[PDB]
Design a protein around this motif. Structure first.
Motif, mmCIF file in Angstrom:
data_model
loop_
_atom_site.group_PDB
_atom_site.id
_atom_site.type_symbol
_atom_site.label_atom_id
_atom_site.label_comp_id
_atom_site.label_asym_id
_atom_site.label_seq_id
_atom_site.Cartn_x
_atom_site.Cartn_y
_atom_site.Cartn_z
ATOM 1 N N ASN A 192 -25.227 42.845 -42.200
ATOM 2 C CA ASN A 192 -23.923 43.325 -41.518
ATOM 3 C C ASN A 192 -24.150 43.205 -39.816
ATOM 4 O O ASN A 192 -25.348 43.342 -39.334
ATOM 5 N N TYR A 193 -22.974 43.314 -39.065
ATOM 6 C CA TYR A 193 -23.061 43.175 -37.635
ATOM 7 C C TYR A 193 -22.082 43.977 -36.982
ATOM 8 O O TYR A 193 -21.239 44.405 -37.735
ATOM 9 N N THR A 194 -22.583 44.308 -35.569
ATOM 10 C CA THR A 194 -21.384 45.010 -34.982
ATOM 11 C C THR A 194 -21.040 44.397 -33.778
ATOM 12 O O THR A 194 -21.768 43.375 -33.169
ATOM 13 N N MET A 195 -19.805 44.302 -33.570
ATOM 14 C CA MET A 195 -19.233 43.537 -32.473
ATOM 15 C C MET A 195 -18.429 44.627 -31.567
ATOM 16 O O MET A 195 -17.351 45.527 -32.134
ATOM 17 N N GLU A 196 -18.847 44.578 -30.055
ATOM 18 C CA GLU A 196 -18.205 45.573 -29.125
ATOM 19 C C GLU A 196 -17.867 44.880 -27.897
ATOM 20 O O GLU A 196 -18.396 43.601 -27.516
ATOM 21 N N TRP A 197 -17.102 45.797 -27.053
ATOM 22 C CA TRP A 197 -16.661 44.953 -25.817
ATOM 23 C C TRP A 197 -16.798 46.063 -24.540
ATOM 24 O O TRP A 197 -15.726 47.189 -24.694
ATOM 25 N N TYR A 198 -17.794 46.219 -23.723
ATOM 26 C CA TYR A 198 -17.882 47.394 -22.815
ATOM 27 C C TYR A 198 -18.427 46.934 -21.338
ATOM 28 O O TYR A 198 -18.509 45.643 -21.301
ATOM 29 N N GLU A 199 -18.701 48.065 -20.678
ATOM 30 C CA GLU A 199 -19.033 47.803 -19.153
ATOM 31 C C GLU A 199 -20.526 47.367 -19.033
ATOM 32 O O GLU A 199 -21.454 47.904 -19.911
ATOM 33 N N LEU A 200 -20.614 46.597 -18.195
ATOM 34 C CA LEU A 200 -22.083 46.036 -17.720
ATOM 35 C C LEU A 200 -22.940 46.980 -17.098
ATOM 36 O O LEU A 200 -24.022 47.253 -17.423
ATOM 37 N N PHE A 201 -22.210 47.988 -16.344
ATOM 38 C CA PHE A 201 -22.640 48.945 -15.607
ATOM 39 C C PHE A 201 -22.118 50.261 -15.638
ATOM 40 O O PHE A 201 -22.036 51.262 -14.818
ATOM 41 N N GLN A 202 -21.169 50.434 -16.720
ATOM 42 C CA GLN A 202 -20.756 51.863 -17.392
ATOM 43 C C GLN A 202 -19.419 52.193 -16.675
ATOM 44 O O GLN A 202 -19.034 51.374 -15.760
ATOM 45 N N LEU A 203 -18.867 53.249 -17.094
ATOM 46 C CA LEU A 203 -17.474 53.207 -16.972
ATOM 47 C C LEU A 203 -16.960 53.455 -15.612
ATOM 48 O O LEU A 203 -16.287 53.065 -14.894
ATOM 49 N N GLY A 204 -18.062 54.675 -14.637
ATOM 50 C CA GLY A 204 -17.715 55.011 -13.591
ATOM 51 C C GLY A 204 -17.508 53.821 -12.449
ATOM 52 O O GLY A 204 -16.771 53.706 -11.633
ATOM 53 N N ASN A 205 -18.663 52.852 -12.650
ATOM 54 C CA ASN A 205 -18.916 51.697 -11.985
ATOM 55 C C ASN A 205 -17.445 50.637 -12.184
ATOM 56 O O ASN A 205 -17.147 49.966 -11.341
ATOM 57 N N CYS A 206 -16.931 50.810 -13.422
ATOM 58 C CA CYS A 206 -15.759 50.022 -13.589
ATOM 59 C C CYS A 206 -14.613 50.668 -13.110
ATOM 60 O O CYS A 206 -13.513 50.271 -12.941
ATOM 61 N N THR A 207 -14.553 51.983 -12.854
ATOM 62 C CA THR A 207 -13.342 52.804 -12.278
ATOM 63 C C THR A 207 -13.267 52.985 -10.795
ATOM 64 O O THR A 207 -12.228 52.928 -10.353
ATOM 65 N N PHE A 208 -14.293 53.305 -10.228
ATOM 66 C CA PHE A 208 -14.410 53.517 -8.685
ATOM 67 C C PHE A 208 -15.470 52.582 -8.001
ATOM 68 O O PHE A 208 -16.375 52.408 -8.790
#
Ligand SMILES: *[C@@H]1O[C@H](CO)[C@@H](O[C@@H]2O[C@H](CO)[C@@H](O[C@@H]3O[C@H](CO)[C@@H](O)[C@H](O)[C@@H]3O)[C@H](O)[C@H]2NC(C)=O)[C@H](O)[C@H]1NC(C)=O
Ligand SMILES: *[C@@H]1O[C@H](CO)[C@@H](O[C@@H]2O[C@H](CO)[C@@H](O)[C@H](O)[C@H]2NC(C)=O)[C@H](O)[C@H]1NC(C)=O
Ligand SMILES: *[C@@H]1O[C@H](CO)[C@@H](O)[C@H](O)[C@H]1NC(C)=O
Ligand SMILES: *[C@@H]1O[C@H](CO)[C@@H](O)[C@H](O)[C@H]1NC(C)=O
Length: 285
Positions: A71-87
């Motif tokens: 079985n496998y997991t598939m996701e989509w998220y930040e390369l440098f995490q949430l704060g760097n994607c927000t500010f």
């Protein structure tokens, strides 16, 4: 002068991350390439949720095959995490604030049951053919190269039903919903299970377009407004002083500065301002 929600802007390719962007924890550490399934395979499709505003959950999709066994997991998220994607970061050698806001898809072997079943959800929602899966795989790749940046805020007019939406976020949950809609296009049929997602909402009036990064910062641009955006962003990054600055900008003065599609907008805040909801988004039919 626009249509109701500003659409998310895609790109023809994904640029490499600027060396200034470095992650403390590595993005997709166990990511394997997406394998090709046998056409007549039976692939169980699982809903995966776990905690990252009491209910702020991370979303992912599980796949199990009968022939492969694995079985496998598939996701989509930040390369440098949430704060760097927000500010953004403010660097003194640049007139414009710099962002490390790239998000992308991650696919790897195995499903960590304890991670999702402890304080979250692990439920099968579909069963698709290998063919479907393969087709889905292709779409993911295209998506991964055209939707390159992560966006946190959903911007709406009010918490009411039927209230106008100014901006949709582009995060992990939206990726899951995109995958499920694509599978629905192939004819896949989902079970009828209540599926709720976390959505972080800003409430404001109609936004105003301020401009792109060169139309605001630099020689051919406004100085007072550029310093205004900088003064707005500075507290969100290195405490109490920053908290009071943020409360005065957002609550007292009802002002937000939204980076979206690599352009700058103004949000006249209102209502409960910042609400974190956990609301139903039904599986596609
Ligand atoms: C979607 O696009 C992103 C960004 O282009 C891809 O991210 C990259 O994924 C690979 C593997 O999935 C990463 O390599 C891994 O590195 C770790 C250690 O750094 C290693 O242990 C692994 O074995 C693997 O070699 C890579 O770092 C990561 N980031 C970049 C900037 O390339 C992602 O793979 C794409 N996903 C899909 C489904 O297309
Ligand atoms: C957010 O981005 C910043 C800037 O790239 C990252 O901070 C850097 O992290 C590296 C590795 O830990 C350090 O060597 C640099 O000195 C840091 N620079 C600055 C300006 O802080 C940060 O790691 C990113 N956030 C996360 C959670 O990964
Ligand atoms: C995935 O497979 C592992 C065995 O490799 C098993 O422990 C786990 O329970 C499986 N998860 C699902 C959702 O099938
Ligand atoms: C899911 O969201 C709906 C709103 O559509 C809400 O009524 C329901 O209570 C939520 N369920 C959970 C378990 O939070």
């Amino acid at each position: 002068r626009r249509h109701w929600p500003v659409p998310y802007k895609r790109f023809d390719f994904r640029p490499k991350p600027d060396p200034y962007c470095q992650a403390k924890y590595t993005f997709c550490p166990t990511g394997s390439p997406i394998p090709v399934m046998e056409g007549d395979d039976d692939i169980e499709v699982f809903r995966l949720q776990a905690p990252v505003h009491l209910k702020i959950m991370h979303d992912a999709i599980g796949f199990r095959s009968t022939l492969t066994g694995k079985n496998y997991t598939m996701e989509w998220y930040e390369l440098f995490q949430l704060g760097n994607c927000t500010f953004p970061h403010l660097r003194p050698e640049m007139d414009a604030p710099f962002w490390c806001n790239q998000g992308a898809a991650c696919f790897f072997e195995g499903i960590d049951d304890v991670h999702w079943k402890e304080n979250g959800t692990l439920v099968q929602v579909a069963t698709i053919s290998g063919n479907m899966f393969n087709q889905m795989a292709k779409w993911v790749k295209q998506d991964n190269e055209t939707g390159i940046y992560y966006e946190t805020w959903n911007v709406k007019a009010s918490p009411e039903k039927g209230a106008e939406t100014w901006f949709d976020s582009y995060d992990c949950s939206k990726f899951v919903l995109r995958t499920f809609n694509k599978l629905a296009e192939f004819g896949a049929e989902f079970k009828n299970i209540e599926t709720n997602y976390t959505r972080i909402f800003l409430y404001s009036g109609e936004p105003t377009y301020l401009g792109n990064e060169t139309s605001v910062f630099g020689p051919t641009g406004n100085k007072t407004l550029g310093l205004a955006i900088k003064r707005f962003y500075y507290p969100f990054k290195p405490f109490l002083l920053s908290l009071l600055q943020i409360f005065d900008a957002v609550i007292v003065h009802k002002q937000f500065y939204l980076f979206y599609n690599f352009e700058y907008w103004f949000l006249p805040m209102k209502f409960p301002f910042i609400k974190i909801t956990y609301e139903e988004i039904p599986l596609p039919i």
